[PDB]
Design a binder for these strands. Structure first.
Lengths: 102, 521
DNA sequence: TTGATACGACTGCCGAGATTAGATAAAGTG
DNA sequence: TGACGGCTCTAATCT
DNA sequence: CACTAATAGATTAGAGCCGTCACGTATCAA
């Protein structure tokens, strides 16, 4: 929980958050395709049951419209970390996955 | 039904010369008959392309055509839209695009992509601007250009979505290789998205479209291909090769053709003196080596190439077009001017004090007929270079629309764009006086921008609607579903076509045209 | 007079505003 | 079929 | 002219990837 309250920016504080997982991504980890599909990739941080920190890479792709059956992620640019989206919100939505070649 | 099918039957056999089909006359029921027979014909035979031409947008039977295809279709029916293509206008295409975008008519393949989303937003804004412009009662040219740019944006979006999807990239999009890959990819995996693509953009793969229902205005005012931005002309497209073009309301395909021809003639002007001398230098370029040879051979062969050149060189000395004319009202052709050659001035004068009048009035027709003959010769060479280039570059019916061929010939010969346009307009001509050589009006002018020379501006008209019908008769064969200067010249047609003809300043120019028509009659 | 072993491997800058005349250039109908 | 080896997406498993 | 309708996650388990196999330079031993 305390990790989930954190942020990537230097000299930050405890900001409330609703996303179960802490996914950290900035502007450097970002690329576009020929369809201009914004595709970030974050750094998932999680402490497992045996108190080991896991830093696995999570990749997110862009979807135009909301998907009520799939998980929808929105990039919080100010805090520099991805957030879960429970209701339709202004901005650009994201979903887990990386189907491009590289 | 069977009557119209039998009538259309003999056209393919008579397509050895692309015959006439007369004028089946009768009093909406007649139109509904042709669509059923045409549908059955196209369903029965795989290799046959029809060009049903109507006259009014409402008169187009888009609902009647679709309610006759499945009726004539067997169990192994085609995808309708994959064969039937209704050519639409930019305005209605934009309207349909917006309508499909709003209520999810378009498939999700082009919806999930964000570039399509932004292109449709831009298109909607541009269409709002177009509506405001239409409300303004203004010249629709600027707004049409803006709307065309907006639609080209989403068109290009479709290509950039399809290219990476298929096994290709490189984003002309390989107009000989990856175009085939795109068309093949959109023919095997899609089930419903292909239907929408074919229904919305029929020009994406036009060669495989069977029936082309379109209004006469769009039939004579070119069409915009999917991939390319510049609009190719219908009358020259390889698509029209060996086609059967039904002319519904054929009696009305006279005024439209004449009106378009008169605007085309008035719009494109050039100086006769400069245009002739420029052509002769380009013609002399051929004989004296030069040229890329690929084009050089054909020219050295077919002996008449040297006779046109020696004719040019002979009359150049006679009329001194090498020397620049000088001035100190229209001149129609079917108080007068003269021209000496004051050596002192080293030019020729044309002020009236008759000294050595070589009957300049006969100078004009000699140059006119020489230009006509040279342009026909260049047209034949352009056709040869066209067939050669298309044959070595085997491709999906898309190359050298023979406007490009003649324009390339003229650009290699060292001629300007306007001069090339005038020469091609004169050339595309392969009996009464009008239907033989037509009208040729000339008008002198002066300008402080060029005071040492006088531009002999020439307006040329040689494409009467009967000759347009004859050319459409060389490219394809017409039908006669139709039922003084608005009924063609059927006698002249029966004279020319012969064995195959039967069985079952705008205002000024207009006036002039009508006159000699009458005189000829 | 050369054969080892411990460490170098360097990216730029970072807006607003105001003034002109300039052939052109298509193809439409609810 | 340079191959080792971390590890990333993604199908699988598991309520 | 037209839409409404009304929609498993979370956590492992594995195939298959890229990418790293160090290189040109001062410098003490032998």
């Amino acid at each position: 929980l305390l990790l989930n309250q954190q942020s990537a920016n230097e000299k930050s504080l405890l900001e409330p958050c609703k996303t179960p997982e802490l996914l950290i991504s900035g502007e450097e980890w970002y690329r576009e395709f020929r369809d201009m599909r914004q595709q970030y990739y974050a750094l998932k941080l999680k402490v497992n049951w045996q108190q080991d920190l896991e830093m696995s890479v999570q990749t997110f792709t862009q979807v135009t419209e909301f998907q009520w059956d799939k998980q929808i992620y929105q990039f919080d640019e100010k805090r520099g970390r991805f957030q879960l989206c429970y209701q339709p919100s202004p901005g650009i939505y994201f979903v887990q996955g990386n189907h491009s070649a590289n | 039904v069977s009557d119209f099918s039998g009538m259309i039957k003999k056209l393919q056999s008579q397509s050895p010369e692309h015959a006439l089909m007369l004028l089946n006359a009768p009093t909406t029921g007649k139109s509904y008959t042709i669509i059923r027979a045409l549908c059955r014909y196209a369903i029965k035979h795989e290799n046959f392309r029809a060009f049903f031409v109507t006259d009014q947008k409402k008169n187009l039977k888009e609902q009647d055509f679709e309610v006759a295809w499945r009726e004539e279709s067997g169990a192994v029916h085609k995808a309708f839209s994959e064969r039937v293509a209704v050519v639409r206008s930019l305005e209605d295409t934009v309207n349909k695009l917006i309508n499909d975008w709003d209520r999810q008519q378009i498939p999700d393949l082009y919806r999930s992509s964000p570039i399509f989303k932004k292109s449709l937003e831009n298109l909607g804004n541009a269409f709002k601007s177009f509506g405001m412009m239409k409300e303004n009662e203004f010249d629709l040219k600027n707004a049409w250009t803006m709307l065309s740019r907006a639609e080209y944006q989403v068109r290009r979006a479709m290509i950039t979505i399809l290219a990476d999807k298929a096994h290709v990239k490189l984003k002309f999009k390989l107009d000989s290789i990856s175009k085939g890959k795109i068309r093949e990819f959109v023919s095997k995996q899609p089930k419903a998205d292909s239907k929408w693509l074919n229904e919305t953009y029929p020009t994406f793969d036009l060669e495989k479209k069977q029936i082309i229902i379109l209004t006469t205005a769009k039939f004579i005012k070119s069409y915009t291909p999917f991939f390319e931005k510049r609009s190719k002309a219908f009358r020259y497209s390889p698509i029209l090769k060996d086609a059967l073009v039904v002319l519904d309301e054929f009696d009305s395909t006279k005024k439209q053709i004449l009106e378009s021809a008169i605007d085309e003639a008035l719009k494109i002007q050039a100086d006769l003196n400069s245009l002739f001398v420029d052509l002769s230098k380009g013609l002399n370029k051929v004989n004296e080596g030069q040229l890329p040879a690929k084009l050089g051979k054909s020219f050295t062969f077919r002996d008449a190439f040297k006779e046109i050149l020696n004719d040019a060189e002979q009359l150049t000395a006679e009329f001194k077009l090498d020397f620049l004319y000088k001035m100190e009202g229209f001149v129609m052709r079917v108080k007068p001017w003269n021209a000496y050659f004051d050596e002192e001035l080293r030019q020729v004068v044309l002020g009236r004090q008759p000294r050595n009048d070589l009957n300049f009035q006969r100078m004009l027709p000699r140059i006119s007929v020489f230009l006509k003959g040279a342009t026909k010769f260049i047209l034949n060479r352009a056709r040869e270079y066209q067939v050669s280039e298309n044959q070595k570059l085997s491709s999906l019916d898309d190359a050298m629309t023979i406007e490009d061929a003649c324009f390339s010939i003229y650009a290699a010969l060292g001629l300007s764009k306007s001069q090339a346009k005038i020469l091609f307009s004169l050339g595309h001509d392969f009996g009464r006086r009008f239907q033989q050589r037509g009208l040729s009006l000339f008008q002198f002018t002066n300008d402080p921008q060029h005071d040492l020379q006088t531009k002999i501006n020439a307006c040329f008209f040689n494409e009467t609607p009967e000759r347009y019908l004859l050319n459409l008769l060389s490219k394809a064969n017409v039908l006669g579903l139709s039922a003084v200067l608005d009924n063609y010249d059927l006698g002249y047609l029966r004279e020319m076509l012969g064995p195959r003809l039967l069985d079952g300043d705008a205002a000024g120019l207009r006036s002039i045209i009508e006159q000699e028509y009458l005189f000829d009659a």
